[PDB]
Nucleic acid binder design. Structure first.
Ligand SMILES: [Mg+2]
Ligand SMILES: [Mg+2]
Ligand SMILES: [Mg+2]
Ligand SMILES: [Mg+2]
Ligand SMILES: [Mg+2]
Ligand SMILES: [Mg+2]
Ligand SMILES: [Mg+2]
Ligand SMILES: [Mg+2]
Ligand SMILES: [Mg+2]
Ligand SMILES: [Mg+2]
Ligand SMILES: [Mg+2]
Ligand SMILES: [Mg+2]
Ligand SMILES: [Mg+2]
Ligand SMILES: [Mg+2]
Ligand SMILES: [Mg+2]
Ligand SMILES: [Mg+2]
Ligand SMILES: [Mg+2]
Ligand SMILES: [Mg+2]
Ligand SMILES: [Mg+2]
Ligand SMILES: [Mg+2]
Ligand SMILES: [Mg+2]
Ligand SMILES: [Mg+2]
Ligand SMILES: [Mg+2]
Ligand SMILES: [Mg+2]
Ligand SMILES: [Mg+2]
Ligand SMILES: [Mg+2]
Ligand SMILES: [Mg+2]
Ligand SMILES: [Mg+2]
Ligand SMILES: [Mg+2]
Ligand SMILES: [Mg+2]
Ligand SMILES: [Mg+2]
Ligand SMILES: [Mg+2]
Ligand SMILES: [Mg+2]
Ligand SMILES: [Mg+2]
Ligand SMILES: [Mg+2]
Ligand SMILES: [Mg+2]
Ligand SMILES: [Mg+2]
Ligand SMILES: [Mg+2]
Ligand SMILES: [Mg+2]
Ligand SMILES: [Mg+2]
Ligand SMILES: [Mg+2]
Ligand SMILES: [Mg+2]
Ligand SMILES: [Mg+2]
Ligand SMILES: [Mg+2]
Ligand SMILES: [Mg+2]
Ligand SMILES: [Mg+2]
Ligand SMILES: [Mg+2]
Ligand SMILES: [Mg+2]
Ligand SMILES: [Mg+2]
Ligand SMILES: [Mg+2]
Ligand SMILES: [Mg+2]
Ligand SMILES: [Mg+2]
Ligand SMILES: [Mg+2]
Ligand SMILES: [Mg+2]
Ligand SMILES: [Mg+2]
Ligand SMILES: [Mg+2]
Ligand SMILES: [Mg+2]
Ligand SMILES: [Mg+2]
Ligand SMILES: [Mg+2]
Ligand SMILES: [Mg+2]
Ligand SMILES: [Mg+2]
Ligand SMILES: [Mg+2]
Ligand SMILES: [Mg+2]
Ligand SMILES: [Mg+2]
Ligand SMILES: [Mg+2]
Ligand SMILES: [Mg+2]
Ligand SMILES: [Mg+2]
Ligand SMILES: [Mg+2]
Ligand SMILES: [Mg+2]
Lengths: 159, 137, 204
RNA sequence: GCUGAAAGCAUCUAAGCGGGAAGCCCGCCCCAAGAUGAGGCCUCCCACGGCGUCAAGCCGGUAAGGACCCGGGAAGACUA
RNA sequence: UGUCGGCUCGUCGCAUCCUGGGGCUGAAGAAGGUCCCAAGGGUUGGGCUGUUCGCCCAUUAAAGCGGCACGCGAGCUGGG
RNA sequence: GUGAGGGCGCGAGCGAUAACGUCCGCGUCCGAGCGCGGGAACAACCGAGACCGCCAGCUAAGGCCCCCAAGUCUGGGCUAA
């Protein structure tokens, strides 16, 4: 929680940092206890319903802090002969097998890059934004259940 | 020989809306539309307050009602039953929700219709600032 | 959103390159904008087009005052094209260029009290093997005790035609500014000498 | 499928988010203000002339306008 | 309270025949199997028999099932 | 006069531990109490046996958020469908 700038509102919480800042709407019936060089969260009870809500806001904010701490990002392996990505301007266009080569928009708050036609990272301040866009690309061509083609993460082949 | 009331005068009200529970609000509202709060009350006459609601768009409702609570509406035609979820209503013309909720709690006779006109519903707030705007809660 | 009034004159055919093309001759005669319709004080956007000149003898109506409040020659007929704000003067067949495509409205021919046979292209019954008093008749129209009534919509004999009809996506073949003629692909409602509005399509 | 707790892990879910059907809502064509909750815009006409004091009425004349009648119509049973 | 079948006109259900979407597959691909979502619309012509039903000929995206007094005789037919 | 009875609870046969089915036994209500309150409506389920009158009063079942009389009553739990 260094160089961070937490804050508090009715339901949400702010988190400022080198990277920027993000809204972090969180549990209403929860405590957003701000300390010196640290934050915190406290639940009004010990119910089955309460427990679940606690940990969420716990992590949720921590990732918010982590987001502006350094920022998230993810790999992307392009297997298969033709298949290969190409960063055109801000946006990613990548061929794979469709006669028409797919082009992908560059969403706000996210910045992907092709360090090589067989690699694509996706840098972002939001663990959420990161997560979707990652899969979005993989979706463009799931892994071939019968071979080894199309997008992949850092997870084993399908085979 | 019981007292029969004479020609009174409309008492306009002005109810809020935001936060208030749909059902619970309607309840009170109608009991104003009928005079049933005013001791000088009488069935056959019709002399309840001119209720005016504002910011009905901000009516709250418990549970999954926003999704589950569907309205029906049967056009005379075949397959003409057209249903509509609470969401969609509040999206589009919202006062509509509060309107019927009340309507459904007014007596079913002609003056029951007469009583409905007495209700002016909105979402702004701000009505046509006639004269009386005696806020209530 | 282009739009312009006209009258169906009749129809024949012309030859594109070396292949014949059936066409109806609309006449989108000069139309003076008589009033603009803005949200500011109308709630919606549109343009009151006028069409066809008129002798002030019938215009005795204070309509003269309407035409006056816009300095226009009193026309005979005027209808609005919606969501179409031109420039402050007069529309021509010129709004349309060859190759464009148009939707066209008109009042279909009046077929009066129609037989269900024609009104709804039914099929009635046998010209032969019996009954003989039910040839062009509709047959059953319901069921027993349940429902016990008839659907609001039931196709039954009645007034057919003389209704409002819009036909979609006609291509504007030719346009002769010389004499105010629109040339479309034939199929257009109303009878000759009939009134008809014409506008841009919805291919997109 | 993302982010994610209860439940140190894991989970598409419980808070929340994205993807997703000839289907739903709209969009397209027709009707539609008897939508008595009778809408709206442009223009035109405009005071009493006589009984009703008080009140909403009543009477013959009026305006802008309309109607009747007649000649007709790809409108039409009739009417419109 | 007229009874089968046909004819006319249909309309509703969905336990889906086709087209749309999806998981699994003993899914390489193509094709198929099976389950889940999904009525919007579609669901042919003839031979035989009173027929319903069914067999058959030639096609189809498919030639779904069922409710509506086994819908429908103040609509028709009248082969049974 | 009646010698078609009917439903409900209970106890049996028949029935298929089906039927607004049937056949006996005990009771009951309708029949004849389709008069009154409750149950949305409804012979026989719950309440109750209408001599007539009253712009009086207590209660029965049931009910007291609005249509609809009367508590959005008090206190302690549970349920998120
Ligand atoms: Mg760093
Ligand atoms: Mg990094
Ligand atoms: Mg990186
Ligand atoms: Mg980086
Ligand atoms: Mg307020
Ligand atoms: Mg929602
Ligand atoms: Mg239905
Ligand atoms: Mg529809
Ligand atoms: Mg207002
Ligand atoms: Mg005028
Ligand atoms: Mg239009
Ligand atoms: Mg439009
Ligand atoms: Mg022009
Ligand atoms: Mg005969
Ligand atoms: Mg004969
Ligand atoms: Mg005959
Ligand atoms: Mg005969
Ligand atoms: Mg005969
Ligand atoms: Mg019949
Ligand atoms: Mg009926
Ligand atoms: Mg020119
Ligand atoms: Mg000229
Ligand atoms: Mg994944
Ligand atoms: Mg996590
Ligand atoms: Mg456990
Ligand atoms: Mg975890
Ligand atoms: Mg959720
Ligand atoms: Mg979206
Ligand atoms: Mg979506
Ligand atoms: Mg219209
Ligand atoms: Mg109109
Ligand atoms: Mg309305
Ligand atoms: Mg004068
Ligand atoms: Mg005077
Ligand atoms: Mg006087
Ligand atoms: Mg005449
Ligand atoms: Mg005539
Ligand atoms: Mg299904
Ligand atoms: Mg099946
Ligand atoms: Mg399918
Ligand atoms: Mg395959
Ligand atoms: Mg499959
Ligand atoms: Mg025989
Ligand atoms: Mg066949
Ligand atoms: Mg059928
Ligand atoms: Mg049967
Ligand atoms: Mg049957
Ligand atoms: Mg039959
Ligand atoms: Mg007969
Ligand atoms: Mg018959
Ligand atoms: Mg028959
Ligand atoms: Mg014979
Ligand atoms: Mg024979
Ligand atoms: Mg015979
Ligand atoms: Mg006996
Ligand atoms: Mg007995
Ligand atoms: Mg007895
Ligand atoms: Mg007995
Ligand atoms: Mg029994
Ligand atoms: Mg007795
Ligand atoms: Mg009774
Ligand atoms: Mg009952
Ligand atoms: Mg009785
Ligand atoms: Mg009784
Ligand atoms: Mg008392
Ligand atoms: Mg008591
Ligand atoms: Mg009690
Ligand atoms: Mg309590
Ligand atoms: Mg309690």
């Amino acid at each position: 929680p260094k160089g961070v700038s937490v804050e508090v509102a009715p339901g949400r919480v702010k988190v400022k940092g080198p990277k920027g800042e993000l809204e972090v709407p969180v549990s209403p019936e929860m405590r957003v206890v701000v300390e010196e060089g640290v934050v915190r969260v406290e639940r009004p009870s010990d119910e089955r319903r309460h427990k679940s809500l606690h940990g969420l806001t716990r992590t949720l904010i921590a990732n918010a802090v982590k987001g502006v701490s350094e920022g998230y990002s993810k790999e992307l392996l392009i297997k298969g002969i033709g298949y290969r990505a190409r960063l055109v301007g801000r946006a990613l266009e990548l061929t794979v097998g469709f006669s028409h080569p797919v082009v992908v928009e560059p969403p706000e708050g996210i910045t992907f890059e092709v360090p090589e036609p067989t690699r694509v990272r996706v840098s972002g301040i939001d663990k959420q934004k990161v997560g979707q866009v990652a899969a979005n690309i993989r979706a463009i061509r799931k892994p071939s259940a019968y071979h080894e083609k199309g997008i992949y993460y850092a997870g084993e082949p399908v085979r | 020989k019981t007292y029969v009331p004479k020609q009174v005068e409309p008492r306009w009200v002005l109810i809020d809306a935001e936060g208030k529970t749909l059902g619970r609000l309607a309840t009170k509202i109608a009991t104003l539309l009928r005079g049933k709060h005013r001791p000088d009350w009488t069935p056959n006459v019709a002399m309840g307050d001119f209720v005016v609601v504002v910011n009905a768009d901000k009516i709250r409702v418990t549970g999954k009602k926003l999704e589950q609570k569907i309205y029906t509406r049967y056009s005379g035609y075949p397959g003409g039953l057209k249903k509509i979820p609470l969401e969609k209503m509040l999206a589009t013309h919202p006062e509509r929700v509060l309107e019927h909720a009340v309507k459904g709690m007014l007596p079913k006779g002609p003056l029951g219709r007469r009583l409905f006109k007495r209700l002016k519903v909105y979402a702004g707030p701000d009505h046509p600032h006639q004269a009386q705007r005696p806020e209530k809660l | 959103m282009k739009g312009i009034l006209g009258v169906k004159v009749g129809m024949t055919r012309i030859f594109r390159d070396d292949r014949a093309v059936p066409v109806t001759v609309i006449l989108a005669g000069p139309c003076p904008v008589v009033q603009r319709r803005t949200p500011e004080k109308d709630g919606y956007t549109a343009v009151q087009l006028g069409f066809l000149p008129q002798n002030p003898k019938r215009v005795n109506r204070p309509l003269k005052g309407h035409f006056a409040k816009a300095g226009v020659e009193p026309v005979r007929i005027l209808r609005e094209i919606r969501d179409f704000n031109p420039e402050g003067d007069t529309v021509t067949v010129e709004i349309f260029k060859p190759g464009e495509r148009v939707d066209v409205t008109g009042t279909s021919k009046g077929r009066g009290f129609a037989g269900v046979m024609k009104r709804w292209n039914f099929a009635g019954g046998p010209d032969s093997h019996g009954a003989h008093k039910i040839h062009r008749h509709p047959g059953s129209i319901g069921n027993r005790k349940t429902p016990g009534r008839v659907y609001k919509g039931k196709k039954m004999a009645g007034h057919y035609g003389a209704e409002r009809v819009t036909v979609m996506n006609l291509e504007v073949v030719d346009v002769i500014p010389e004499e105010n003629l629109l040339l479309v692909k034939g199929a257009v409602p109303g009878p000759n000498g009939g009134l008809v509005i014409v506008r841009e399509t919805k291919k997109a």
